[PDB]
Amino acid sequence: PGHMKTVLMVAEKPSLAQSIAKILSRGSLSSHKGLNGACSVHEYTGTFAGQPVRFKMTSVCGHVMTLDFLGKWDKVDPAELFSQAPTEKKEANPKLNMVKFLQVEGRGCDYIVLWLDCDKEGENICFEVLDAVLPVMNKAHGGEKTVFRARFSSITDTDICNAMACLGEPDHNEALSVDARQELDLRIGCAFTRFQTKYFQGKYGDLDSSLISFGPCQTPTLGFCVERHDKIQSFKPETYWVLQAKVNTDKDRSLLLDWDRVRVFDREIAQMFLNMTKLEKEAQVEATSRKEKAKQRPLALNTVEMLRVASSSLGMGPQHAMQTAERLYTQGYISYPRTETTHYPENFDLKGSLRQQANHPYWADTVKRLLAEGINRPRKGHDAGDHPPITPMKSATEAELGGDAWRLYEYITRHFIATVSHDCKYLQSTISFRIGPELFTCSGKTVLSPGFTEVMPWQSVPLEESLPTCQRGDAFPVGEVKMLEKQTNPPDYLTEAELITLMEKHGIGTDASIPVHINNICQRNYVTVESGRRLKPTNLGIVLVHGYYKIDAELVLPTIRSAVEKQLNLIAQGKADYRQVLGHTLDVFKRKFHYFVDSIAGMDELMEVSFS
Ligand SMILES: [Mg+2]
Numbered sequence: 001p002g003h004m005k006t007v008l009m010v011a012e013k014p015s016l017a018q019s020i021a022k023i024l025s026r027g028s029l030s031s032h033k034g035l036n037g038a039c040s041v042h043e044y045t046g047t048f049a050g051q052p053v054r055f056k057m058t059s060v061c062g063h064v065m066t067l068d069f070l071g072k073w074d075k076v077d078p079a080e081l082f083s084q085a086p087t088e089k090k091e092a093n094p095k096l097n098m099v100k101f102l103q104v105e106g107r108g109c110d111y112i113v114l115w116l117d118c119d120k121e122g123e124n125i126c127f128e129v130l131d132a133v134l135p136v137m138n139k140a141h142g143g144e145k146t147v148f149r150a151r152f153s154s155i156t157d158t159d160i161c162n163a164m165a166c167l168g169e170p171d172h173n174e175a176l177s178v179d180a181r182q183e184l185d186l187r188i189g190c191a192f193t194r195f196q197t198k199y200f201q202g203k204y205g206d207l208d209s210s211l212i213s214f215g216p217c218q219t220p221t222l223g224f225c226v227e228r229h230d231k232i233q234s235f236k237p238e239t240y241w242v243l244q245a246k247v248n249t250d251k252d253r254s255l256l257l258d259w260d261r262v263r264v265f266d267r268e269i270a271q272m273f274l275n276m277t278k279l280e281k282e283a284q285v286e287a288t289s290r291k292e293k294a295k296q297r298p299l300a301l302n303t304v305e306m307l308r309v310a311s312s313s314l315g316m317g318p319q320h321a322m323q324t325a326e327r328l329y330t331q332g333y334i335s336y337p338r339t340e341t342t343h344y345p346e347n348f349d350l351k352g353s354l355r356q357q358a359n360h361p362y363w364a365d366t367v368k369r370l371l372a373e374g375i376n377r378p379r380k381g382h383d384a385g386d387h388p389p390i391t392p393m394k395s396a397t398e399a400e401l402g403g404d405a406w407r408l409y410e411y412i413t414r415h416f417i418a419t420v421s422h423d424c425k426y427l428q429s430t431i432s433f434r435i436g437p438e439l440f441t442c443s444g445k446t447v448l449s450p451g452f453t454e455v456m457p458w459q460s461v462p463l464e465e466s467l468p469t470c471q472r473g474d475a476f477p478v479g480e481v482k483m484l485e486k487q488t489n490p491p492d493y494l495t496e497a498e499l500i501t502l503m504e505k506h507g508i509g510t511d512a513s514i515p516v517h518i519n520n521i522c523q524r525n526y527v528t529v530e531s532g533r534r535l536k537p538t539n540l541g542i543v544l545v546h547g548y549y550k551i552d553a554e555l556v557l558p559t560i561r562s563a564v565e566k567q568l569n570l571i572a573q574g575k576a577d578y579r580q581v582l583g584h585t586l587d588v589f590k591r592k593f594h595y596f597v598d599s600i601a602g603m604d605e606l607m608e609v610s611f612s
Contacts, residue, residue, distance in 0.1 A: 017059035207611035241270035257440035300389035318515030342381030
């Protein structure tokens with residue numbers, strides 16, 4: 001043979017590179033600092049393609065490049081930003097000299113193995129890395145297969161070693177989809193925004209025009225929040241009436257009965273119902289029922305659900321939750337937290353994972369019992385073919401993780417244990433009473449077996465007194481018949497969880513970009529985070545959405561954005577053309593831009609009134 005080949009391997013972050021290399025080298029790792037200070041280099045000897053080679057594992061630091069125009073406060077025509085103005089990739093963090101670092105460590109290498117995180121974003125970074133390293137590689141084995149791509153979902157021995165055993169190739173289609181989204185959002189975003197910042201610059205005393213922006217995704221996202229605001233302001237409470245009766249059992253208990261008609265919105269018919277029941281002194285039992293029912297254990301955890309719970313229960317904003325989750329993934333405590341999958345792959349050792357939790361004080365006894373009783377089969381969920389559900393991959397304590405990391409890990413773990421636990425079994429009981437012509441019911445739940453609600457106590461069935469045993473035909477003295485007059489209540493501002501659900505429902509913010517957009521409209525102070533993590537539109541945010549809507553509703557409605565993202569996903573699947581999707585979309589929004597500029601009065605008028 002000739003010279004021993006050197007295999008360069010690149011992960012997305014320094015910690016990832018170190019951990020992966022430590023696993024693959026079985027601890028025979030030799031590490032030294034790179035030129036940039038951020039990135040280290042991990043070297044060791046091993047085997048590749050049945051041959052002894054030298055391994056050289058390092059990393060980048062997230063995206064190497066960001067898309068920008070070719071060449072701030074300078075005088076350019078926003079209309080030119082659609083087609084004329086050229087765009088080019090620039091280093092996302094120039095001080096790190098990432099391209100130079102890759103060239104230096106990648107020089108003279110024969111093979112490259114890509115260990116970037118496995119999403120479309122990661123595939124895009126693959127070609128960032130390849131663009132830097134390929135020109136500097138050794139030319140010897142230059143006509144061989146020199147580029148490899150590892151696929152993995154967790155930084156664990158099992159998943160990382162298997163990745164090496166079945167190396168694939170980087171997906172250029174998925175990489176192109178990321179590029180296309182970046183270029184679309186940059187051009188369309190800056191065009192509509194820069195026009196307004198200049199147009200309104202110093203125009204009104206109480207308006208800092210630099211606060212105005214448009215985004216093909218962030219604006220519809222804000223649109224949802226402002227829509228709720230509008231519903232709240234225009235809400236008209238309605239009076240309604242509820243008939244309720246109280247009954248005395250044989251064991252001298254007051255049963256509160258629920259009206260079969262539940263409620264009424266007519267004053268006269270309400271008075272009519274009260275009159276025909278208030279004098280009745282006896283309630284006849286017409287029917288009884290006992291039904292064993294199940295409160296199901298949760299579906300396996302996906303990203304969208306994690307974000308809802310982290311917000312609603314843990315008080316973490318979507319971006320805060322994602323970075324916390326990503327850090328957990330980085331240290332190998334959970335699987336990759338960007339997934340739509342709610343279905344456990346068949347190969348996955350669930351009992352093994354459960355066994356890992358058998359020693360934590362909070363659920364050791366619960367887990368041990370489950371291992372003795374035998375694990376339940378998780379519910380069949382959805383397999384999006386991206387990653388497994390977000391699952392604990394390693395045991396942990398609050399000492400190891402710290403505040404935010406532990407709180408998120410505890411939920412992910414408790415949620416997991418529940419998926420492999422049993423359903424909650426309870427008794428649903430009902431009694432039907434006849435009072436005059438009117439029907440009434442009283443209901444009650446009795447827990448038979450807690451099931452998963454032991455490890456998830458917040459989903460437990462509330463303790464209620466068992467309904468009295470009685471027979472059809474039995475009669476109870478009516479203790480009281482009253483009619484409640486009530487008022488319908490307005491909705492509250494959108495919670496982050498509701499917004500997440502809305503964005504998922506309308507198909508915007510796909511590929512886990514939802515937390516970015518939500519954080520964006522918060523960072524721009526278009527909404528404020530109020531108690532219960534509610535998103536209350538600010539004055540400017542309201543004005544902006546109303547302004548955009550008056551000019552062109554399609555700028556605010558998620559319809560257009562949803563279709564674009566579907567087109568972008570088709571690029572990723574190789575079912576749509578990169579350049580054609582770019583061209584068509586940019587044409588559509590260029591047309592809307594010119595209409596926007598012509599109809600700017602729709603925005604200006606609202607701006608004048610609100611900001612003098
Ligand atoms: Mg990434």
